[PDB]
């Protein structure tokens, strides 16, 4: 819920900075060069 997220954020500069940092880390995590992650002897990864 975008409105709920914005309301939870409020207008704190520190809150905005922290949200930006967390968003950057998360956008780093999901999505990468490879397609299917092979983490383990049996690997299930989702290109779609």
């Amino acid at each position: 819920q975008a409105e709920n997220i914005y309301n939870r954020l409020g207008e704190d500069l520190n809150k905005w900075q922290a949200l930006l940092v967390q968003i950057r880390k998360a956008r780093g995590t999901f999505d990468n060069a490879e397609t299917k992650k092979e983490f383990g002897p049996v690997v299930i990864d989702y290109g779609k």
């Binding site: 956008r27 999505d31 990468n32």
Partner: peptide, 29 residues
């Protein structure tokens, strides 16, 4: 050998080979 390598880029002459190249894409950010 230098002439042959130049041609390959393009018997005592020789004929070397070539490797691959760094070609790819990303959307990281």
């Amino acid at each position: 050998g230098l002439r042959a390598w130049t041609q390959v880029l393009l018997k005592p002459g020789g004929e070397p080979k070539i490797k691959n190249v760094v070609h790819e894409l990303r959307i990281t950010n």
